[PDB]
Design an enzyme around this catalytic site. Sequence first.
Site, PDB file in Angstrom:
ATOM      1  N   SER A 240       1.240  11.844  -4.463  1.00 40.66           N
ATOM      2  CA  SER A 240       0.947  10.422  -4.278  1.00 40.66           C
ATOM      3  C   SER A 240      -0.088  10.135  -3.196  1.00 40.66           C
ATOM      4  CB  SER A 240       2.241   9.637  -3.999  1.00 40.66           C
ATOM      5  OG  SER A 240       2.943  10.154  -2.880  1.00 40.66           O
TER       6      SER A 240
ATOM      7  N   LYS B 272      -1.623   3.616  -3.608  1.00 41.57           N
ATOM      8  CA  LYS B 272      -1.527   2.168  -3.301  1.00 41.57           C
ATOM      9  C   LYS B 272      -2.761   1.386  -3.645  1.00 41.57           C
ATOM     10  CE  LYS B 272       1.890   2.239   0.157  1.00 41.57           C
ATOM     11  NZ  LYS B 272       2.075   3.634   0.470  1.00 41.57           N
TER      12      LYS B 272
ATOM     13  N   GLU C 291       2.343  -7.299   3.793  1.00 46.00           N
ATOM     14  CA  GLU C 291       3.180  -6.564   4.732  1.00 46.00           C
ATOM     15  C   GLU C 291       2.676  -5.133   4.812  1.00 46.00           C
ATOM     16  OE1 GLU C 291       3.882  -6.832   1.578  1.00 46.00           O
ATOM     17  OE2 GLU C 291       4.617  -4.869   0.953  1.00 46.00           O
TER      18      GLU C 291
HETATM   19  N1  LIG Z   1       5.784   1.197   4.267  1.00 49.27           N
HETATM   20  C1  LIG Z   1       4.604   1.612   3.432  1.00 49.27           C
HETATM   21  C2  LIG Z   1       4.876   1.337   1.948  1.00 49.27           C
HETATM   22  C3  LIG Z   1       5.288  -0.062   1.638  1.00 49.27           C
HETATM   23  C4  LIG Z   1       4.520  -1.188   1.700  1.00 49.27           C
HETATM   24  N2  LIG Z   1       5.263  -2.286   1.338  1.00 49.27           N
HETATM   25  C5  LIG Z   1       6.533  -1.878   1.023  1.00 49.27           C
HETATM   26  C6  LIG Z   1       7.644  -2.619   0.598  1.00 49.27           C
HETATM   27  C7  LIG Z   1       8.807  -1.929   0.353  1.00 49.27           C
HETATM   28  C8  LIG Z   1       8.882  -0.531   0.523  1.00 49.27           C
HETATM   29  C9  LIG Z   1       7.779   0.200   0.944  1.00 49.27           C
HETATM   30  C10 LIG Z   1       6.581  -0.478   1.203  1.00 49.27           C
HETATM   31  C11 LIG Z   1       3.283   0.961   3.855  1.00 49.27           C
HETATM   32  O1  LIG Z   1       3.247  -0.093   4.488  1.00 49.27           O
HETATM   33  O2  LIG Z   1       2.202   1.476   3.564  1.00 49.27           O
END
Ligand SMILES: N[C@@H](Cc1c[nH]c2ccccc12)C(=O)O
Lengths: 387, 383
Positions: B369, B82, B104
């Site tokens: 990952s 990420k 988010e």
């Molecule tokens: N849920 C994971 C990955 C993620 C971030 N934003 C997302 C949008 C759609 C699907 C998965 C994600 C996180 O917050 O680290």
Amino acid sequence: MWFGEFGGQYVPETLIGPLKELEKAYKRFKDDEEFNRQLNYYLKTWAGRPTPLYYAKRLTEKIGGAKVYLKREDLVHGGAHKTNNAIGQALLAKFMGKTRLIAETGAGQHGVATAMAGALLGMKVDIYMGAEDVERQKMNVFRMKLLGANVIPVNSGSRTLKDAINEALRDWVATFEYTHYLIGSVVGPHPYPTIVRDFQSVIGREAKAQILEAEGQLPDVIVACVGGGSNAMGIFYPFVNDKKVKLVGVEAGGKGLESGKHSASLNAGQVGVSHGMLSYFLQDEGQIKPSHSIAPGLDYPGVGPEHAYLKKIQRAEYVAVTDEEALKAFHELSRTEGIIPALESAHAVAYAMKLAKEMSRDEIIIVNLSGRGDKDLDIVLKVSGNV
Amino acid sequence: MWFGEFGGQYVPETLIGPLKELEKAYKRFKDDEEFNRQLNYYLKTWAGRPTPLYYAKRLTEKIGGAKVYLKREDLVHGGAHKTNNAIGQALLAKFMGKTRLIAETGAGQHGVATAMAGALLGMKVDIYMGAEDVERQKMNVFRMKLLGANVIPVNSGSRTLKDAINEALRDWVATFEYTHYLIGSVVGPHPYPTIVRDFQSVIGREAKAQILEAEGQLPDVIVACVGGGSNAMGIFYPFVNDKKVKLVGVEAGGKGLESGKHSASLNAGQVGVSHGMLSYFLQDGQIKPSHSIAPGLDYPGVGPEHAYLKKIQRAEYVAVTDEEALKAFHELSRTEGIIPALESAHAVAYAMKLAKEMSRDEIIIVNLSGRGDKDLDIVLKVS
Ligand SMILES: N[C@@H](Cc1c[nH]c2ccccc12)C(=O)O
Ligand SMILES: N[C@@H](Cc1c[nH]c2ccccc12)C(=O)O
Ligand code: NA
Ligand code: NA
């Protein structure tokens, strides 16, 4: 075997045979083309070397002094510089035909690194760990177990790192034929202080190449934290012959140097013999007395003999940073550069920040960021509080 | 805009203005010499790219079939892929003159990466996170605050990822002049699916060069886990035009595909519009809850570029249960000295089964990952 007056092989006669066999094997394999091929291959593809040299531009500007670079040992596999040593010695062990690794650990970090290297190379792993440290480091004990290692609680003596080392030595005398004792810092009897320094010196060799590439010159100061001293020796050693480069080792000042709760052996200890080496130890009576640090990797009453030597000949300077100062540096680096450092490494950061403010803007400081702070979040959560 | 029929930009008029400004900025900067000098510099010196390609020798010999290689994204700064997206977008924001990042998060992992990137570039960071996820991710919440970010609990709807996305979008329409919305996977309206995939494709380009050096040939199979789909697209995208290279995405089987507790949107979901895109979603009808032991895979939707690949049959998509991913977590730790993220363990679990069927001349690359340090508390409770 000696670094001036420090070092030696202060061990029973039953250990001299095993140490001579290790000394002979290491002398053969250290320059062997096949050993170094495999070592460099594992360091590259499994550990992720080389690590970068990072210019902490925001931190530099905020202090408004010298340029502060961070050698990113936090990015090696496992989150600390210890992996370099664990792979080197575990591979040496395999080339000597050993099938089992043993190791001491206090913080658990060396225990984890040894367990990882053991898993990688298909070797059995037993970790000796003082019962007080086992209680304090539940997650590292779990990491070791996940990695396939067996953790052996040491209940004798003070039930901590010094006692684990002694119990590991007692095992090795009986099992040396199939077992390699994987020591986790630049400590113990010869040849261990040399072997661990040699396997960590890749940090400094990379750092030297990266800084000449980034800035066209040697740094003015290199700063590293010192527990036993392996990450400091690793980054120091390739600059020992470069006279202009100041080397600064940073010890755990704990609650304060006059509090009696610290691990600053070079600063406030005396000359002594423990764990096979003549070096500086904190002691009362002759009794090696308990140390303390908020950073569990710096919590050892002794120090490597090569640091005692470098201090004696004035090649390196040694200082202390308190628990509170390190804790401020941990928060500061996290929010200024987005890098959560190990609390151990935060001591070196804390000193570098004070040192940069004094120094000129043309000058350059390299800080050895020996590890990452993931392991320390529970501790920092308790002591700094929830925010 | 679209990937076959999937993707798109199905948002109200209040989102068209900021999204179009982002497309123009992205067009301008994506190939700009100064932008890329700064990006590659941050990816090298701060994130620690390139990551290695590791031959899992003991795992390969044990299984007795194909050579298993692991692309070691677990070694990037922060412990997961990420970071690649977080740096690229945050840098884009700085180049666009934005001073604030919003994002988010559900697992906390994108929240941490955005917090780190925001710290790196001297930007304010507010993370929208569902209250249910805030309660289940104490240490990631602590990490974010430690990194200087604020964590805004989201109380509307189901109090999880989809709702946090909605709140960030309502923030971004109000604040886009000085705020960049940093989305965390290959989802949402154009141009976010393209931008995120572009910033992750570095994974695949490295992996291609690396397997050519180690083995002299492209791999027979690439295996990656699929939540939203950003790590899978990162490694897939450079191999799309290499026809011999099979691509396999592994979704969260959860408690079982028959159980109703999973996140396999491609496998068992239906096509629909949500968060401004046409893709697959788990449905009751309306969008229903998802589940996985791996919190990163816990999302009822999936990226539109994966929907497109599944349709053309360029990539095959499968599911791995909680139990199976757990077994692979322990196996990789014990056998190779690498503690994988539970998300990544899904990919490993399937690559192990697949390797068994295949021959010793053949090659599998698994996108590892992330690292498993973040998952230890969860694995300890089960163990
Ligand atoms: N849920 C994971 C990955 C993620 C971030 N934003 C997302 C949008 C759609 C699907 C998965 C994600 C996180 O917050 O680290
Ligand atoms: N206590 C730390 C570092 C360490 C290991 N062995 C040592 C010997 C001496 C001094 C320090 C150490 C750890 O176990 O991770
Ligand atoms: Na000490
Ligand atoms: Na999904």
